[model samples]
Target: AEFKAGSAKKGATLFKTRCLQCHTVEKGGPHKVGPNLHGIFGRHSGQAEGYSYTDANIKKNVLWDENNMSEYLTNPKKYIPGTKMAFGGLKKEKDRNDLITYLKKATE
Candidate 1:
């Protein structure tokens, strides 16, 4: 199956519904639980200040790759053991894909 551009748009909705409160992708946006996610992809993890990041995340500068993102979203505690983003995770594959696309697009 091919991923359509609409995937990004769907991701936007998912981001708003699922991730907006904690993360701010657009520059200068407010931070709730997590940091502003602008240019998040390929960026080092746990580098932002002010917010208390999980010890594991601080130690492991993770990349937001598809596999990494999927695992993290599927099970934050199981994967990282420590993350400030407290909303468990998106269990469905479609939701995960859409949310990832949204994170990439909106934050760009």
Candidate 2:
């Protein structure tokens, strides 16, 4: 499928509806089931401070760039089997794009 650019506003809505239960993107945000995602884009996966990451996540060593994150968000379990993140994949490509946009803006 062809990809489209996303909006931060729409992304924030999607994030709240789908991802806020487990994750956060604000600076100084609290970690929930998942680690706080502030400043996550350039960081190596599983390295978020104050969060206990699975060895699989840390060792995978994939950086959370927009493309990688979009792919991972499509299917978390498939992206890294044995990862602690349990949310089912976001099946919509647009949603992934929007979420990635939101993260990039939120982190910057």
Candidate 3:
């Protein structure tokens, strides 16, 4: 499913539960276990300031967008090997859609 084809309201709740522990979406929010995710869309991978990224992530510096983001969320380890992110990938299509939908707005 397309990432845009999701409910932002449901996505918001999903973000709080699934992503908040490791990430922060608000602008200028501090990095948690993961990088603060403000402005994540359209940014390159591993470019967030003050975060220690794996060399694998730095080397796989693709631009963030709907397709790659959805792909990564589906399987982070498969998308970029040797990533430090500890969370397993979201398995459900709708779950990924909703989370990405929330992130598109929240991370701006």
Candidate 4:
């Protein structure tokens, strides 16, 4: 299947429901369980400042991109193998797309 341009507004809704508990989107937002995601695009995984990361994540050194984020959002463990993320992964393709759209705005 092909991916589509997503809605940041809907993505905000999804983030509120699904991701706000663990992550934040505002610049310099607080780090909950996950790293603060301001400008997460192009940033290395497991290397966000002020947060500790798993060794597997450090080793993965993934560069965030639309496809990579989509894949990771679909299945975090499958993407990184040993990540500390306890999230079950987003199954809906649209949700993943919207989240990435929102994140693109937040990151850039």
Candidate 3 residue lDDT tens string, 20-95? 9999998788768998889989999999988999999989998999878999989899999999988788899898
Best model number under lDDT: 3
**For model 4, how does the per-residue alpha-carbon lDDT over 1-108 read when each residue is reduced to its tens digit?**
555778999988888888889988787766698888887888877777878888998899888878888989899999999788999899999999898888888767
Residue-wise C-alpha lDDT for candidate 2, range 2-108, written one tens digit per residue? 33568989888988899899888887877688888888888899888889999999989997788888888899989999998888898988888887787788877
> Which runs in model 2 stand beyond 4 Å of their true positions?
1-4
Task: Supply the global lDDT for candidate 1.
Answer: 0.74
What is the lDDT, from 0 to 100, of the residue 4 in candidate 4? 70
In Å, residue 38's CA in model 3 sits off its true spot by: 0.5
lDDT by candidate, in order shown: 0.74, 0.85, 0.88, 0.85
Please identify which of the two predictions, 2 or 3, would achieve the higher lDDT against the true structure. Answer: 3
CA shift at 50, candidate 1, in angstroms? Answer: 4.5
Instruction: Candidate 1: list runs displaced more than 4 Å.
Output: 1-6
Better of 1 and 4 by lDDT: 4
The stretch of ten residues in a row with the least summed lDDT in candidate 2 is 1-10
Decreasing lDDT order of the candidates: 3, 4, 2, 1
Model 3: residues with Cα > 4 Å off, grouped in runs: none
- As a whole number from 0 to 100, the lDDT of residue 55 in candidate 1 is 79
User: Between which residue pairs do clashes occur in model 4?
Assistant: none
Query: Per-residue lDDT of 1-49 in model 1, one digit per residue for the tens?
Result: 2232338777888888887877888777777678777877777788765
Off by over 4 Å in 4: none
TM-score of 2: 0.91
